[PDB]
Amino acid sequence: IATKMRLRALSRYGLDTEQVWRNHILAGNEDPQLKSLWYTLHFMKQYTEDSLVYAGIKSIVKSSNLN
Amino acid sequence: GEILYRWGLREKRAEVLKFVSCPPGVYCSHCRSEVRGTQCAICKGFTFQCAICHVAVRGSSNFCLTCGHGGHTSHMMEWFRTQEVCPTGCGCHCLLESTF
Amino acid sequence: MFVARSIAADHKDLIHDVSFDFHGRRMATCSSDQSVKVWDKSESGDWHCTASWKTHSGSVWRVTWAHPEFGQVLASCSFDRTAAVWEEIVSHWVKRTTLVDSRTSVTDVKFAPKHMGLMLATCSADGIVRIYEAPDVMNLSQWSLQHEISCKLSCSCISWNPSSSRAHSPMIAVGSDDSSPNAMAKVQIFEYNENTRKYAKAETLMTVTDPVHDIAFAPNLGRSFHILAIATKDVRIFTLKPVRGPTKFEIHIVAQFDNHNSQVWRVSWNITGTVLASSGDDGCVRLWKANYMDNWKCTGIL
Amino acid sequence: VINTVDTSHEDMIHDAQMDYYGTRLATCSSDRSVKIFDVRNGGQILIADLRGHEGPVWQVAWAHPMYGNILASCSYDRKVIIWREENGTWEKSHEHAGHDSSVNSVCWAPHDYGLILACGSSDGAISLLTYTGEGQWEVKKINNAHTIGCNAVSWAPAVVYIKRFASGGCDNLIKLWKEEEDGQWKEEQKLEAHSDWVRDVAWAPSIGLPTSTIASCSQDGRVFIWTCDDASSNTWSPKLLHKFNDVVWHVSWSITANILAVSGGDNKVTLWKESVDGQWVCI
Ligand SMILES: [Zn+2]
Ligand SMILES: [Zn+2]
Ligand SMILES: [Zn+2]
Ligand SMILES: [Zn+2]
């Protein structure tokens, strides 16, 4: 893991705030886990720009042709 | 030496004057006290800490007057060669405050 | 997937110990000719020694550097009951105040993590571990005597806990070297209550009986548990998850192999706490790592 | 060589002096103006055209670069006006007019003392302006200096302090001065070997030889060299170099005090050099 962290830092991993999901293309080759986080973060971010979205779906669908 | 100063050579004036027989507030990170020197007097520790390098500075340095962050001279020389922000994320364009 | 190579350092006597600073740019080498040397690493990559001096009467077992935030300081240990603190002035390595206050020979010398001062942890063969403190960082000539530890056994190896959180007090591990048939213990763990400034006993690994030669804690890196290495005839990696007097650690055992068929001398971790190198008296050494199933497996013996 | 420069002024030129480095050139004139050029590589460029000083200007004097870019400029209007260079622009900084008659001579003091400017007017007084800090000037006067009035002043080189300058005026006597421990500018001596009127006086720079040399110039025309090498005897022996046929105006030393240049009413400039035998020959 230490070797991977070295190549991640050299390729400016994590600092692209314009488009978020493009980070998973900078992480390396393929990781289903790491290609799921950024997509899960991109959809959350582009809804406060158009605060409770960060709470997760559990709090959303607990206090509750669809609602 | 005065003649050499008139001509325009300042290194060779110092070299000559070196042979004359007769002679001619950094905050600490452990106790937050005004210490004048490279070593503290209360906790007896290093007071200056490089803002790029985090190895204690005992020799030459430079810093911004308002932000008060600086370190080894070559370190800031490389850093400020291409950017314009305080390296410790302070928000000052020290190039406009350090240089009058 | 490790590819071995060779270096271009030429010596005269044997080599007993080596150590790396913090940045992996300098190292200190021992030699059974009453001499120690340090080498820099040129930008091109070629090494070149830049120091050599006799330091004691006999042989020097260990040299360990210090954290650079206190300059460039070394710490050597010798057979003839001594433990000194070297410094550097620039060049010439003028020795600071050597301090020997033991009776037997000192077994090992290791520094302390940088987050609590400039402590030092000499231990001797008789079973006395001594703690030195220097609250005069501007001048490293004065050393006090904080709490010493008595265990009434033999001491071979010492190890600290590199954890830096404010939720874990410092801990000391101690290794024996005795071959006595009284097989009771071989590795104890000490702790530190802040309310008494003493050193109690935390636990005891009543699962290793053969002589132990080296103990190396694994770096923390934020995990919720700690890891130790025990260099017996079998290489062993334990595990303690603190439960919620001293704290009650619940031990385990996660690996025990013997694919070296020799006397496993020393073990030490890497910077990131995943790969662990193990040595022995069988010619060439092995590298251990953890796989996807969290079941440690060999990784490239060479 | 030569570095010909056209002044582009409307009247006569009364003084001209260069900087401490060899890069700038100030010019006084009779059009109530002071033009600062930039004489580098022959360039006749302009940097300033400072105006004011109602009368005709007579003299200028640059200050030591260690204190920044300053320039003193006296004139007929009985006002000394002082300039600086802030943000690359030349501006009027301070004016002082504590003189009944025209101020004739200005001379900066040696930099070891500090920043003192000595101005001697035609009303028989010397005004010394000391820079007190924070843009403040202290003025100490010496009333009843000469019978008619001072014409020129000069400052002696600093030795190991005792401040000391030398003034001359229309009474045909050269006077010496010294600052007491309290601050009283007590007179020390007076020299009398001239006939008509002394116009300019100049004190030689020192390079360590135990010998003080002062030149002088008279209206009838006589350059007298006042050597004095008696250490602490305070005795001066006049000599002579020539007797011209006009009014001798100005005398200037070299940096090593081996060549003297004398200019007078004859509309010509002469150079001189002391021989091995002790006589002064032209060149
Ligand atoms: Zn302190
Ligand atoms: Zn640094
Ligand atoms: Zn800052
Ligand atoms: Zn700043």
PDB file of N, CA and C in Angstrom, chain C residues 170-236:
ATOM      1  N   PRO C 170       2.449   5.524  26.756  1.00  0.00           N
ATOM      2  CA  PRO C 170       3.621   4.794  26.261  1.00  0.00           C
ATOM      3  C   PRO C 170       3.719   3.400  26.864  1.00  0.00           C
ATOM      4  N   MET C 171       4.286   2.482  26.084  1.00  0.00           N
ATOM      5  CA  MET C 171       4.418   1.092  26.494  1.00  0.00           C
ATOM      6  C   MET C 171       5.820   0.593  26.173  1.00  0.00           C
ATOM      7  N   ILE C 172       6.327  -0.302  27.022  1.00  0.00           N
ATOM      8  CA  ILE C 172       7.662  -0.876  26.902  1.00  0.00           C
ATOM      9  C   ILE C 172       7.534  -2.391  26.803  1.00  0.00           C
ATOM     10  N   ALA C 173       8.244  -2.990  25.853  1.00  0.00           N
ATOM     11  CA  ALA C 173       8.335  -4.438  25.733  1.00  0.00           C
ATOM     12  C   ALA C 173       9.769  -4.881  25.995  1.00  0.00           C
ATOM     13  N   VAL C 174       9.923  -6.017  26.672  1.00  0.00           N
ATOM     14  CA  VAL C 174      11.231  -6.475  27.137  1.00  0.00           C
ATOM     15  C   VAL C 174      11.411  -7.936  26.756  1.00  0.00           C
ATOM     16  N   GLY C 175      12.588  -8.269  26.227  1.00  0.00           N
ATOM     17  CA  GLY C 175      12.880  -9.638  25.844  1.00  0.00           C
ATOM     18  C   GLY C 175      14.014 -10.276  26.623  1.00  0.00           C
ATOM     19  N   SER C 176      13.892 -11.572  26.916  1.00  0.00           N
ATOM     20  CA  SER C 176      14.909 -12.297  27.672  1.00  0.00           C
ATOM     21  C   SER C 176      15.901 -12.999  26.751  1.00  0.00           C
ATOM     22  N   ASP C 177      16.905 -13.659  27.325  1.00  0.00           N
ATOM     23  CA  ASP C 177      17.854 -14.423  26.523  1.00  0.00           C
ATOM     24  C   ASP C 177      18.235 -15.725  27.217  1.00  0.00           C
ATOM     25  N   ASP C 178      17.606 -16.003  28.355  1.00  0.00           N
ATOM     26  CA  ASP C 178      18.010 -17.136  29.176  1.00  0.00           C
ATOM     27  C   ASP C 178      17.593 -18.458  28.541  1.00  0.00           C
ATOM     28  N   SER C 179      18.435 -19.473  28.732  1.00  0.00           N
ATOM     29  CA  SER C 179      18.115 -20.840  28.353  1.00  0.00           C
ATOM     30  C   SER C 179      17.715 -21.703  29.539  1.00  0.00           C
ATOM     31  N   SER C 180      17.373 -21.097  30.671  1.00  0.00           N
ATOM     32  CA  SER C 180      17.038 -21.858  31.866  1.00  0.00           C
ATOM     33  C   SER C 180      15.794 -22.706  31.618  1.00  0.00           C
ATOM     34  N   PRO C 181      15.713 -23.908  32.188  1.00  0.00           N
ATOM     35  CA  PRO C 181      14.540 -24.764  31.959  1.00  0.00           C
ATOM     36  C   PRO C 181      13.268 -24.200  32.569  1.00  0.00           C
ATOM     37  N   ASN C 182      13.395 -23.140  33.368  1.00  0.00           N
ATOM     38  CA  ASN C 182      12.242 -22.517  34.017  1.00  0.00           C
ATOM     39  C   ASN C 182      11.465 -21.735  32.963  1.00  0.00           C
ATOM     40  N   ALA C 183      10.763 -22.480  32.113  1.00  0.00           N
ATOM     41  CA  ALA C 183      10.000 -21.873  31.032  1.00  0.00           C
ATOM     42  C   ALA C 183       8.707 -21.274  31.567  1.00  0.00           C
ATOM     43  N   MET C 184       8.748 -19.987  31.906  1.00  0.00           N
ATOM     44  CA  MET C 184       7.569 -19.294  32.410  1.00  0.00           C
ATOM     45  C   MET C 184       7.152 -18.169  31.471  1.00  0.00           C
ATOM     46  N   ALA C 185       8.090 -17.291  31.127  1.00  0.00           N
ATOM     47  CA  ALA C 185       7.810 -16.150  30.269  1.00  0.00           C
ATOM     48  C   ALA C 185       9.041 -15.804  29.448  1.00  0.00           C
ATOM     49  N   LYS C 186       8.823 -15.095  28.341  1.00  0.00           N
ATOM     50  CA  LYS C 186       9.913 -14.570  27.533  1.00  0.00           C
ATOM     51  C   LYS C 186       9.713 -13.127  27.087  1.00  0.00           C
ATOM     52  N   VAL C 187       8.512 -12.563  27.226  1.00  0.00           N
ATOM     53  CA  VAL C 187       8.245 -11.199  26.784  1.00  0.00           C
ATOM     54  C   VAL C 187       7.176 -10.564  27.666  1.00  0.00           C
ATOM     55  N   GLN C 188       7.520  -9.460  28.317  1.00  0.00           N
ATOM     56  CA  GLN C 188       6.581  -8.714  29.139  1.00  0.00           C
ATOM     57  C   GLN C 188       6.328  -7.335  28.535  1.00  0.00           C
ATOM     58  N   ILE C 189       5.208  -6.734  28.931  1.00  0.00           N
ATOM     59  CA  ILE C 189       4.765  -5.452  28.395  1.00  0.00           C
ATOM     60  C   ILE C 189       4.464  -4.521  29.558  1.00  0.00           C
ATOM     61  N   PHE C 190       5.062  -3.335  29.545  1.00  0.00           N
ATOM     62  CA  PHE C 190       4.857  -2.360  30.605  1.00  0.00           C
ATOM     63  C   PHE C 190       3.959  -1.228  30.123  1.00  0.00           C
ATOM     64  N   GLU C 191       3.465  -0.453  31.088  1.00  0.00           N
ATOM     65  CA  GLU C 191       2.535   0.635  30.817  1.00  0.00           C
ATOM     66  C   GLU C 191       2.899   1.861  31.640  1.00  0.00           C
ATOM     67  N   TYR C 192       1.999   2.841  31.700  1.00  0.00           N
ATOM     68  CA  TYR C 192       2.295   4.091  32.395  1.00  0.00           C
ATOM     69  C   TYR C 192       0.985   4.747  32.808  1.00  0.00           C
ATOM     70  N   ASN C 193       0.645   4.649  34.088  1.00  0.00           N
ATOM     71  CA  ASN C 193      -0.450   5.443  34.622  1.00  0.00           C
ATOM     72  C   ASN C 193       0.034   6.865  34.870  1.00  0.00           C
ATOM     73  N   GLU C 194      -0.750   7.845  34.423  1.00  0.00           N
ATOM     74  CA  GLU C 194      -0.342   9.236  34.568  1.00  0.00           C
ATOM     75  C   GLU C 194      -0.533   9.748  35.988  1.00  0.00           C
ATOM     76  N   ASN C 195      -1.227   8.989  36.840  1.00  0.00           N
ATOM     77  CA  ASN C 195      -1.555   9.430  38.190  1.00  0.00           C
ATOM     78  C   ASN C 195      -0.497   9.048  39.219  1.00  0.00           C
ATOM     79  N   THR C 196       0.512   8.269  38.833  1.00  0.00           N
ATOM     80  CA  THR C 196       1.503   7.805  39.796  1.00  0.00           C
ATOM     81  C   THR C 196       2.928   7.937  39.271  1.00  0.00           C
ATOM     82  N   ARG C 197       3.073   8.187  37.969  1.00  0.00           N
ATOM     83  CA  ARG C 197       4.381   8.326  37.322  1.00  0.00           C
ATOM     84  C   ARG C 197       5.236   7.072  37.490  1.00  0.00           C
ATOM     85  N   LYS C 198       4.595   5.910  37.562  1.00  0.00           N
ATOM     86  CA  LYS C 198       5.270   4.637  37.750  1.00  0.00           C
ATOM     87  C   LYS C 198       5.160   3.793  36.481  1.00  0.00           C
ATOM     88  N   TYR C 199       5.705   2.578  36.541  1.00  0.00           N
ATOM     89  CA  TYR C 199       5.700   1.653  35.407  1.00  0.00           C
ATOM     90  C   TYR C 199       5.155   0.317  35.899  1.00  0.00           C
ATOM     91  N   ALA C 200       3.864   0.080  35.672  1.00  0.00           N
ATOM     92  CA  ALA C 200       3.238  -1.166  36.096  1.00  0.00           C
ATOM     93  C   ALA C 200       3.477  -2.270  35.075  1.00  0.00           C
ATOM     94  N   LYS C 201       2.830  -3.416  35.266  1.00  0.00           N
ATOM     95  CA  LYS C 201       2.899  -4.527  34.329  1.00  0.00           C
ATOM     96  C   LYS C 201       1.562  -4.657  33.616  1.00  0.00           C
ATOM     97  N   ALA C 202       1.605  -4.720  32.286  1.00  0.00           N
ATOM     98  CA  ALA C 202       0.379  -4.769  31.502  1.00  0.00           C
ATOM     99  C   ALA C 202      -0.063  -6.203  31.245  1.00  0.00           C
ATOM    100  N   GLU C 203       0.787  -6.993  30.596  1.00  0.00           N
ATOM    101  CA  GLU C 203       0.457  -8.372  30.262  1.00  0.00           C
ATOM    102  C   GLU C 203       1.750  -9.174  30.185  1.00  0.00           C
ATOM    103  N   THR C 204       1.623 -10.445  29.812  1.00  0.00           N
ATOM    104  CA  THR C 204       2.775 -11.327  29.677  1.00  0.00           C
ATOM    105  C   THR C 204       2.445 -12.400  28.651  1.00  0.00           C
ATOM    106  N   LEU C 205       3.323 -12.563  27.665  1.00  0.00           N
ATOM    107  CA  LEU C 205       3.105 -13.519  26.581  1.00  0.00           C
ATOM    108  C   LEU C 205       3.600 -14.886  27.030  1.00  0.00           C
ATOM    109  N   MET C 206       2.732 -15.622  27.716  1.00  0.00           N
ATOM    110  CA  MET C 206       3.050 -16.982  28.148  1.00  0.00           C
ATOM    111  C   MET C 206       2.820 -17.982  27.020  1.00  0.00           C
ATOM    112  N   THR C 207       3.422 -17.701  25.865  1.00  0.00           N
ATOM    113  CA  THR C 207       3.325 -18.579  24.709  1.00  0.00           C
ATOM    114  C   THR C 207       4.627 -18.681  23.930  1.00  0.00           C
ATOM    115  N   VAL C 208       5.698 -18.039  24.386  1.00  0.00           N
ATOM    116  CA  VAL C 208       7.025 -18.177  23.799  1.00  0.00           C
ATOM    117  C   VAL C 208       7.982 -18.557  24.919  1.00  0.00           C
ATOM    118  N   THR C 209       8.707 -19.662  24.734  1.00  0.00           N
ATOM    119  CA  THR C 209       9.640 -20.158  25.735  1.00  0.00           C
ATOM    120  C   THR C 209      11.083 -20.203  25.263  1.00  0.00           C
ATOM    121  N   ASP C 210      11.326 -20.463  23.984  1.00  0.00           N
ATOM    122  CA  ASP C 210      12.676 -20.432  23.456  1.00  0.00           C
ATOM    123  C   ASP C 210      13.236 -19.013  23.555  1.00  0.00           C
ATOM    124  N   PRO C 211      14.561 -18.862  23.567  1.00  0.00           N
ATOM    125  CA  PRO C 211      15.142 -17.524  23.730  1.00  0.00           C
ATOM    126  C   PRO C 211      14.689 -16.573  22.632  1.00  0.00           C
ATOM    127  N   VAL C 212      14.430 -15.328  23.023  1.00  0.00           N
ATOM    128  CA  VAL C 212      14.029 -14.277  22.098  1.00  0.00           C
ATOM    129  C   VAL C 212      15.233 -13.385  21.838  1.00  0.00           C
ATOM    130  N   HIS C 213      15.388 -12.945  20.588  1.00  0.00           N
ATOM    131  CA  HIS C 213      16.549 -12.162  20.187  1.00  0.00           C
ATOM    132  C   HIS C 213      16.222 -10.749  19.720  1.00  0.00           C
ATOM    133  N   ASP C 214      14.977 -10.467  19.336  1.00  0.00           N
ATOM    134  CA  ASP C 214      14.620  -9.136  18.862  1.00  0.00           C
ATOM    135  C   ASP C 214      13.112  -8.950  18.952  1.00  0.00           C
ATOM    136  N   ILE C 215      12.695  -7.735  19.297  1.00  0.00           N
ATOM    137  CA  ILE C 215      11.287  -7.368  19.390  1.00  0.00           C
ATOM    138  C   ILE C 215      11.099  -6.041  18.666  1.00  0.00           C
ATOM    139  N   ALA C 216      10.095  -5.972  17.790  1.00  0.00           N
ATOM    140  CA  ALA C 216       9.861  -4.790  16.966  1.00  0.00           C
ATOM    141  C   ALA C 216       8.371  -4.503  16.902  1.00  0.00           C
ATOM    142  N   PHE C 217       7.956  -3.359  17.438  1.00  0.00           N
ATOM    143  CA  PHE C 217       6.560  -2.967  17.329  1.00  0.00           C
ATOM    144  C   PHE C 217       6.231  -2.532  15.904  1.00  0.00           C
ATOM    145  N   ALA C 218       4.989  -2.790  15.501  1.00  0.00           N
ATOM    146  CA  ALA C 218       4.586  -2.310  14.187  1.00  0.00           C
ATOM    147  C   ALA C 218       4.051  -0.884  14.285  1.00  0.00           C
ATOM    148  N   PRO C 219       4.376  -0.033  13.311  1.00  0.00           N
ATOM    149  CA  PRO C 219       3.934   1.364  13.371  1.00  0.00           C
ATOM    150  C   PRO C 219       2.419   1.465  13.410  1.00  0.00           C
ATOM    151  N   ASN C 220       1.926   2.494  14.099  1.00  0.00           N
ATOM    152  CA  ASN C 220       0.497   2.583  14.379  1.00  0.00           C
ATOM    153  C   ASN C 220      -0.311   2.844  13.114  1.00  0.00           C
ATOM    154  N   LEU C 221      -0.101   3.997  12.485  1.00  0.00           N
ATOM    155  CA  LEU C 221      -0.790   4.446  11.278  1.00  0.00           C
ATOM    156  C   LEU C 221      -2.286   4.633  11.466  1.00  0.00           C
ATOM    157  N   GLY C 222      -2.781   4.700  12.695  1.00  0.00           N
ATOM    158  CA  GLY C 222      -4.180   5.002  12.930  1.00  0.00           C
ATOM    159  C   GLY C 222      -5.052   3.815  13.267  1.00  0.00           C
ATOM    160  N   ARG C 223      -4.541   2.589  13.238  1.00  0.00           N
ATOM    161  CA  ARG C 223      -5.360   1.422  13.519  1.00  0.00           C
ATOM    162  C   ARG C 223      -5.887   1.457  14.950  1.00  0.00           C
ATOM    163  N   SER C 224      -6.846   0.579  15.223  1.00  0.00           N
ATOM    164  CA  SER C 224      -7.421   0.444  16.553  1.00  0.00           C
ATOM    165  C   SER C 224      -6.773  -0.662  17.369  1.00  0.00           C
ATOM    166  N   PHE C 225      -5.682  -1.249  16.885  1.00  0.00           N
ATOM    167  CA  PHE C 225      -4.970  -2.262  17.645  1.00  0.00           C
ATOM    168  C   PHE C 225      -3.480  -2.145  17.359  1.00  0.00           C
ATOM    169  N   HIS C 226      -2.696  -2.924  18.097  1.00  0.00           N
ATOM    170  CA  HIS C 226      -1.246  -2.898  18.016  1.00  0.00           C
ATOM    171  C   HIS C 226      -0.708  -4.264  17.618  1.00  0.00           C
ATOM    172  N   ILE C 227       0.543  -4.283  17.168  1.00  0.00           N
ATOM    173  CA  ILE C 227       1.162  -5.472  16.598  1.00  0.00           C
ATOM    174  C   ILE C 227       2.596  -5.573  17.102  1.00  0.00           C
ATOM    175  N   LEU C 228       3.024  -6.792  17.438  1.00  0.00           N
ATOM    176  CA  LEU C 228       4.376  -7.061  17.910  1.00  0.00           C
ATOM    177  C   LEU C 228       4.988  -8.190  17.097  1.00  0.00           C
ATOM    178  N   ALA C 229       6.313  -8.226  17.071  1.00  0.00           N
ATOM    179  CA  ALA C 229       7.055  -9.301  16.435  1.00  0.00           C
ATOM    180  C   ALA C 229       8.015  -9.917  17.443  1.00  0.00           C
ATOM    181  N   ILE C 230       8.082 -11.246  17.455  1.00  0.00           N
ATOM    182  CA  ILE C 230       8.905 -11.994  18.396  1.00  0.00           C
ATOM    183  C   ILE C 230       9.813 -12.915  17.598  1.00  0.00           C
ATOM    184  N   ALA C 231      11.121 -12.772  17.787  1.00  0.00           N
ATOM    185  CA  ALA C 231      12.117 -13.480  16.984  1.00  0.00           C
ATOM    186  C   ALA C 231      12.656 -14.692  17.741  1.00  0.00           C
ATOM    187  N   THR C 232      11.791 -15.687  17.937  1.00  0.00           N
ATOM    188  CA  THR C 232      12.214 -16.971  18.489  1.00  0.00           C
ATOM    189  C   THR C 232      12.622 -17.909  17.364  1.00  0.00           C
ATOM    190  N   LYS C 233      12.726 -19.202  17.675  1.00  0.00           N
ATOM    191  CA  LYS C 233      12.832 -20.211  16.630  1.00  0.00           C
ATOM    192  C   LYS C 233      11.665 -20.117  15.649  1.00  0.00           C
ATOM    193  N   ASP C 234      10.511 -19.637  16.103  1.00  0.00           N
ATOM    194  CA  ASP C 234       9.368 -19.378  15.243  1.00  0.00           C
ATOM    195  C   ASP C 234       9.072 -17.883  15.196  1.00  0.00           C
ATOM    196  N   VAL C 235       8.906 -17.348  13.983  1.00  0.00           N
ATOM    197  CA  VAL C 235       8.536 -15.946  13.822  1.00  0.00           C
ATOM    198  C   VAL C 235       7.057 -15.776  14.128  1.00  0.00           C
ATOM    199  N   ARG C 236       6.746 -14.904  15.080  1.00  0.00           N
ATOM    200  CA  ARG C 236       5.382 -14.804  15.576  1.00  0.00           C
ATOM    201  C   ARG C 236       4.902 -13.360  15.519  1.00  0.00           C
TER     202      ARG C 236
END
